[PDB]
Amino acid sequence: MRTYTFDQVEKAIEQLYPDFTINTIEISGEGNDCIAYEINRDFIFKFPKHSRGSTNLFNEVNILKRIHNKLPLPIPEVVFTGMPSETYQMSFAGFTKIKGVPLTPLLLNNLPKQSQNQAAKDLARFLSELHSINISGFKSNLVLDFREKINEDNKKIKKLLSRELKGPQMKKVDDFYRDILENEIYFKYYPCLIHNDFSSDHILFDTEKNTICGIIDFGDAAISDPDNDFISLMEEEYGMEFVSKILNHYKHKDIPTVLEKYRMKEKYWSFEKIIYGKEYGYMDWYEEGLNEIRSIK
Ligand SMILES: NC[C@H]1O[C@H](O[C@H]2[C@H](O)[C@@H](O[C@H]3O[C@H](CO)[C@@H](O)[C@H](N)[C@H]3O)[C@H](N)C[C@@H]2N)[C@H](O)[C@@H](O)[C@@H]1O
Ligand SMILES: [Cl-]
Numbered sequence: 001m002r003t004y005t006f007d008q009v010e011k012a013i014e015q016l017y018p019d020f021t022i023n024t025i026e027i028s029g030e031g032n033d034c035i036a037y038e039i040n041r042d043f044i045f046k047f048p049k050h051s052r053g054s055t056n057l058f059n060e061v062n063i064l065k066r067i068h069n070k071l072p073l074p075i076p077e078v079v080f081t082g083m084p085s086e087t088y089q090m091s092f093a094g095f096t097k098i099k100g101v102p103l104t105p106l107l108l109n110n111l112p113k114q115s116q117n118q119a120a121k122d123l124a125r126f127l128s129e130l131h132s133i134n135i136s137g138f139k140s141n142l143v144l145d146f147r148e149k150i151n152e153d154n155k156k157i158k159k160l161l162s163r164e165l166k167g168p169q170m171k172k173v174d175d176f177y178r179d180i181l182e183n184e185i186y187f188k189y190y191p192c193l194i195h196n197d198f199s200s201d202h203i204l205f206d207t208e209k210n211t212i213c214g215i216i217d218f219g220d221a222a223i224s225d226p227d228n229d230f231i232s233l234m235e236e237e238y239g240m241e242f243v244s245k246i247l248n249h250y251k252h253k254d255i256p257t258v259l260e261k262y263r264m265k266e267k268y269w270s271f272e273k274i275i276y277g278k279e280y281g282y283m284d285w286y287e288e289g290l291n292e293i294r295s296i297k
Contacts, residue, residue: 001050001281009037009047012092017080032280033057033219038097043079045094052279054088059142060219061093067133067193073126074098074214098214100204105238107205115210120242122212123203123233124249131192131226138193144224147187150180156275164290172297173271180264185257189225196220198229199237231262 006025013020028038033053034046048054065078080094101107108116154177161170180186195202197220204214230252234243247255273289276282 003049004035004047006037009045009092012047012082013039013045013080013094016082020080031217031219032276039094042097043094044076044097045080045092047092048088048090051087051089054090056219057093058089060217060221061090063142063193063218063221064095066137067130070133071126071129071215073122073212075218076216098204098216100206100213102201103203103205103212104200105236107207108200108238108242111210116242117245118210119205119212120245121249124246126215127195127198127226127229127246128250130195131229133193135191135193135223138223142222143191144196144222145191146189146225147181150177150186153271153275157271160274160278161290161293165294169294173293176267176297180268183264185260186225186264189227191223192226194222194224194226194228196222196224196228196232198232199235200233225261227258227261230258231265234262235266 009025010022013022023040025037025039028036028044030036030049032049033056034048037045037047039045046057046060048057061078061081064076067075068077076095076098078093079096080092082088082091082093085091103119108119111119157173157177158170161173165173195215195218197217198215202215202217203212204216205211206213230243230247230250233246234240244255247258252258270289270292273282273285274293277284277286277289
C-alpha cells in the first residue's frame, strides 16, 4: 500500500500537465483507496494507495464523467487524469474542489427547522435523480448485483476461514448466508446507479446559505440497490427522524424493508471485515471480524 511525497505528486502531474502551475499542496484527506491532495485550493487530486484503489479511482472518474450535469447538487468534476501502468489503472485524477463542510449530525441539528427540512428535501431530490439516471451503458464492472455479491462473499469466507473456524461455528456461517439468500427482499430491487457511500462525511454544507452545496466521493458508486443510500444515512450518522424525512420526500413506499435491510447489513459487517481485512491487509479488521463470527447468530 503505497504513499507519496509532495515531490512525487508534483512530478506526476507536471509530466502530463506541464503548464499547470502548482502553488500550494497539502493532504486534504485519506481513505482506504486513495490519498487526497488539495492543490491551489481549487482541486482535489486523488492518488491510489494501491492497485485496488486505482480501480476504484478509475471507476469514479468514469462515473463522474457520464453523470456530469445531470444532478441537482454540485458533484466533483474531472479536470485532470493520470495514465495506466502495470500497477495502476489510473495513476491519479484531479477533481474540482467543492467548498463546504461535512453536514455532520451535530451541525444538522443545530440548524433552524426550515434548514433541516430543506436539507432532507435536497438530499431526497438528489437521490431521486441519481437513482433515475439511465444505467444502460454502464458495464458489469460498475454493476453490483447483490445476490452475486453475497454468493461471491460466501465462497471467499469459506476459502478464508476454512481452517480458522470450528465445526459448529462454520455451520452458523452457512445458516446465516442461507437465511440471507432465502429472503427475497434483498434481491428484488430495481437496479439503479447509487452513491453507495452516502453518509454525512460526503455531504458538504454551506453555512452561509444554510444549504447543502455538494456531494462528493463517488469511488464506491455502482449499479445496485437504491436502498443502500438510505441505510448508509442511519448507521454514527443521522437519526431515524431525519432519514424518515428524506424517505418521505423520496416517496419511499416500504420503510420497514429499509430497516430490515439495515439490520441485515449491520450483522453482515463482521464478514466484510474478514474479506477486506485480508484483501486490504487490515489485520485488526480480520481479527475483529473473526472474533465476532465466533460468538453470535
Ligand atoms: N467504520 C465502522 C463502520 O463501517 C461501516 O460504515 C461506514 C463506512 O465504512 C465508511 O466508508 C468506508 O468503509 C466502506 C466499507 O468498507 C467502504 O466501502 C468505503 N469506501 C470506505 O470509505 C463510510 N464513510 C461511513 C459508514 N458509516 C459499517 O456499515 C458500520 O456499521 C460501521 O460501524
Ligand atoms: Cl498543461
